[model samples]
Target: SEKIRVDIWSDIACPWCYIGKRRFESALGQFPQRDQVEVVWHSFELDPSARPLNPIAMRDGLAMKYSISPAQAQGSLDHMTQTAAQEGLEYHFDRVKLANTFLAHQLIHYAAEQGQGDAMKERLLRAYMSEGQNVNDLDTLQKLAAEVGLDAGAARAALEAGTYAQAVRYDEAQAQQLGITGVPFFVLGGKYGVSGAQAPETLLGALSQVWAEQHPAPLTMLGQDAPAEGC
Candidate 1:
């Protein structure tokens, strides 16, 4: 009876991360041994140096980052929107504001310490991607953190005092060490690294494969007396 450990590195501001979260959760829901699965959320900043105070439309941000026209970025956005819809996620790119997620990442770690990491992660993702909230704002982070059973005052203090900054940095460092170039990356069983927003079936397949590897089925031998007699 081996438990499957899944380490997922994603950003709250990442749309694909939200989709991946839904897909991963769906896969876990369908998994028979769901109770034996342990999921750990890690932070990865899509833009570590983004200005938190000055937010911009996600489409403009995307256009600027990829050096593409706004119209072209809209196409990409539309694709993401469609993909997110398929996963039962609402992605409003028009309302998505781009800002530095350093503190937001810190908040996730703080929530993790409080045993509410997954709850906090879901709140932040939905707030940023669909509900159109400024996740980088301390007040917003504190309020959302509270919604997930964390102490609002404590969360605010942590954000203001940079309490979990080191942990956030640590996760980022680990992501870099793992050579991860993107968000929504999943590490399964400490041996497999899955990239991007993979389908649930694919994730389930990976999970099954890893589980089998770690807990191999006993080999059964059929009778071979006929072959032995012929020899």
Candidate 2:
């Protein structure tokens, strides 16, 4: 049987993406045919026009963008932090720097070519969401790439040359074509689409359903006259 492909579109700055990654892993752990599943991470910028390095904290950015009070914004982030904690992820919204993820996405593409795509993605998410590292910073990104076993010099060179920039754009364009307007969107077997940070049970169910569809059971045969007799 052909391996099932799961395409995930998310941003490095998206807290939900980290949680979603954990949840999906939990589901995959319980899946009997996990080895037959292939996951490919795609790029999706929540704010393509964001500044390279926004001085404002994520809480403040949220407050200003949604016209909410600082307290309300903190409350929102607090809830998300709690949710992430349930999945064993640390989220520090107060320390999170709101920056453009374009370069970070490009780095992911580079890592994909190096066979460390998932590792790079996980490292970037942890850096941005939990460690307050600036994803848009060249030095920080090169350090992160090195941490994930990539060549720091080559990674920086790729970033400076804007290599894999079009790959990021292509992923975004594909997201648009698929009518995906949110992060943490999962495309299972390139046929089923699961949106948001759904529960592990829900994701597992979707995976099972897709697997069933891809590999249907053979028809059962019965004796025409009667059932088989036991000695």
Candidate 3:
């Protein structure tokens, strides 16, 4: 059977994307046809015009962006932390730095070319949401890429040359055409779409439904009068 392609669009700075990844993985683990699934990561920037450097504290940034108080932002962060903990993920909102994720997205594209796309995405999510790393910095991105087993120097050169910049833009353009306005948007089998950080069971159901449609069982025919005696 052909593999089912799952394309995911998310941002490094989006906390829900990390959580959604965990949920999606959990679903894949439970899927009987997991080996027949192909996963692809796409880029989506929450703030395309954000500064490339000099990130601000996550709480302050959230407060200012949403017109909420710092305390309110803290409450939201606390809730998110609790939710992430349920998924076995540690999110340090206090340590998070807010910056543009364009470079990070480009690095992910580079890593994809090297078969490390998922690893790079996971590393960047951890760095931004838990380790307070400035993802916009070339040095930091290179280090993260190296940590994911990509060639550090080559990764640096790719970022410097903006080799994957167009790739990232292409992903974003696709997102726009698909009417996607949020991170963690999943396109399964290029047909089904599930939005937001849905539960593992929900994701699993979507996967199964798509798989079943793609691999529907063949009908078994009986003779016209074969079953009349039993009836």
Best-performing candidate as measured by lDDT: 2
Whole-model Cα lDDT per candidate? 0.88, 0.93, 0.91
lDDT of 3 by residue, 1-231 (tens): 468899999999899999999999999999999999899999999899988764577888889889999999999899989999988889998787777899999999999998889999999999999898889988999999989999999999999999999999999999999999998999998888899988889999998888888787888987675535543
Candidate with more favorable, higher lDDT: 1 or 2 = 2
lDDT for each residue of candidate 1 in 1-231, tens digit (9 for 90 to 100): 579999999998788899999999988888888888999999999888878755667788889989999999999999999999998887887887776889888988999888888998999988888887888888889899888888999999989998889889999999999999998999998889999989999899888888888887787988675634543
- What 10-residue stretch in candidate 2 is worst by lDDT? 219-228
What clash pairs does model 2 have?
Answer: none
Q: Please report the TM-score between candidate 3 and the true structure.
A: 0.93
Q: Model 3, 173: alpha-carbon shift in Å?
A: 0.8
Q: Write candidate 2's Cα lDDT for 1-231 as tens digits.
A: 558899999999888999999999999999999999988999999999999999987888989988999999999999999999999998888888888999999999999998899999999999998998999999999999999999999999999999999999999999999999998999998889999988899999998998888787788887686767888
Would you give me the overall lDDT of model 1? 0.88
